[PDB]
Amino acid sequence: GRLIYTAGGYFRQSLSYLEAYNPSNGSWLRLADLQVPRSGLAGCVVGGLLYAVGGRNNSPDGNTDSSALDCYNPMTNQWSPCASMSVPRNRIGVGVIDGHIYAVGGSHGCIHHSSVERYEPERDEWHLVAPMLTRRIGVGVAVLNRLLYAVGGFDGTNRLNSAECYYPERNEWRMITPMNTIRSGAGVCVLHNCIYAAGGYDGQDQLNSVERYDVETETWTFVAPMRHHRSALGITVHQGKIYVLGGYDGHTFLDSVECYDPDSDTWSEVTRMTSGRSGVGVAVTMEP
Ligand SMILES: O=C(O)CN(c1cccc(-n2ncc(C(=O)O)c2C2CC2)c1)S(=O)(=O)c1ccccc1
């Protein structure tokens, strides 16, 4: 569609913001708040509807991991609850295949999930599928050619450079080539025939480097780095360019939004969020 939606996130506490950015004119709209604050969620779109999945509500009076699935309709500017997942999943990743939402990994307290489940909007039902070979929280998830990829994360002991791919007709996960960088809390997306991994935390520093996996060659190659180091960033694709939103650079919760042009291999700053934040969910759909 036409707008980049950012939902939730964190600054001092988990946030309820829903704000939509219009690349064609630089404007930001503040829309209906989430019913429950959440950071560490993921966003996706199915059938023009925006979905917010998992996360946690970190507040002064609690830390509650979320199993929730909530649906925002831009025509109504209203959120509606959907069926909840089998388990809470903070620091989640999600991907959409053939109209179904895959929820991957994430945490529930000290439980680091390898489990994966699939939502069918037409039935308002979740079902578990085969689990990953690795437990992954802060996991980047992307879909390319109707295969599901889980990239990096944290397994409960180590941050990971490993990645793996889910083959739905076989209900099976297989490792792919590992990245050249350990990345947890990175932004992962697909552009053309490559899976991009931008930023994240490597155990020592937040990262500005960006690398992409070419599914034809099975190799990871670095591209131009972002202007800002960032972990727990939001990421999406809009008209053939990658947009990264917010995150944490080790000093500040960023309001910076950067845009990658793959033809020129350059990043530029395109706008600022209305306030700095990390751990947002991001997706693109029609204006409301
Ligand atoms: O949930 C939480 O603990 C916090 N948030 C969050 C959200 C998504 C992913 C990750 N994440 N997962 C594994 C690692 C890992 O350090 O290896 C991480 C972090 C990002 C590198 C965490 S946050 O509120 O947005 C937030 C982010 C940064 C600073 C303060 C708060």
The DSSP secondary structure of 65-82, one letter per residue, reads E---EEEEETTTTEEEE-
- Residue 275 phi, psi (nearest 5): -155, 150
List % helix, strand, coil for the chain (3-state, nearest 5).
0, 50, 45
Nearest-angstrom CA–CA distance, 79 and 234: 20
Q: Are 163 and 178 in contact (CB under 8 A)?
A: yes
Distance CA 89, CA 96 (A): 17
| Pocket of ligand 1 contains residue 248 by CB under 6 Å | yes
| Ligand 1 lined by 271 (C-beta under 6 Å) | no
278 touches ligand 1 (CB under 6 Å): yes
**CB 270 within 8 Å of CB 258:** yes
The strands making up 241-245's β-sheet, listed across from edge to edge, are: 234-238, 241-245, 256-261, 266-272
Backbone φ and ψ for 170, nearest 5 degrees, come out as -105, -5
Q: What are phi and psi of 169, to 5 degrees?
A: -70, -15
The span from the CA of 97 to the CA of 102, in Å, is 8
Question: Which residue has a Cα nearest atom 28 of ligand 1?
Answer: 248
**Closest by Cα among 258, 269, 256, 203 to 236:** 258
Q: Please work out whether the CB of residue 55 comes within 6 Å of at least one atom of ligand 1.
A: no
User: What is the spatial distance between Cα 85 and Cα 66, in angstroms, rounded to a whole number?
Assistant: 9
Residues 6+ apart with CB under 8 A from 217: none
**Cα 275 to ligand 1 centroid, rounded to whole Å:** 18
Q: Whose CA is nearest to atom 13 of ligand 1?
A: 138
> What would the two tokens of residue 230 be?
């960032």
Resolution in A: 1.7
Q: Which of 56, 278, 282 to mutate to test the pocket of ligand 1 (most atoms within 8 A of CB)?
A: 278
- CA 282/CA 5 separation, integer angstroms: 6
| CA–centroid distance, residue 169 to ligand 1 (Å) | 33
Main-chain phi, psi angles of 168, to 5 degrees: -60, -40
CA atoms within 13 A on the CB side of 245: 31
CB of 279 closer than 6 angstroms to any ligand 1 atom? yes
Structure tokens at 65: 């991991």
How many residues comprise the chain?
288
Q: Report long-range pairs for 210-214 (Cβ below 8 Å, ≥24 apart).
A: 210/260, 211/179, 211/180, 211/181, 213/149, 213/163, 213/176, 213/177, 213/179
Gap between the Cα atoms of 58 and 10, Å rounded: 8
The protein residue whose alpha carbon is closest to atom 15 in ligand 1 is 184
> Is 281's C-beta closer than 6 angstroms to any atom of ligand 1?
no
DSSP 108-125: ETTEEP--EEEEETTTTE
What letter represents residue 199's amino acid? Answer: G
Q: Phi/psi at 248 (nearest 5 deg)?
A: -125, 130
What is the DSSP-derived secondary structure letter of residue 137? B
Find where tokens 């959120």 sit.
79
Other C-beta atoms closer than 10 Å to the C-beta of 279 total 30
CA distance 225 to 73: 35
Atom of ligand 1 lying closest to residue 248 CA: 28
Q: Does the C-beta of 105 come closer than 6 Å to ligand 1?
A: no
Alpha-carbon distances of 61 from 14, 18, 31, 55, rounded to whole Å:
12, 22, 26, 17
For residue 254, give the nearest of 282, 276, 270 by alpha carbon. Answer: 276
155: which residues sit within 8 A by CB, 6+ positions away? 112, 134, 135, 136, 137
The CB of 40 under 6 Å from ligand 1? The reply is: yes
Rounded Cα gap, residues 202 and 275, in angstroms: 26
Nearest to 44 by CA among 23, 69, 67: 69
List CB contacts of 280: < 8 A, sequence separation 6 or more.
Answer: 6, 7, 8, 9, 39, 41, 43, 234, 245, 246
CA-CA distance, 84 to 71, in Å (whole number)?
Answer: 12
Q: With CA atoms as reference, report the closest residue to 117 among 52, 64, 171, 63.
A: 171
- In the chain, the amino acid numbered 196 is Y
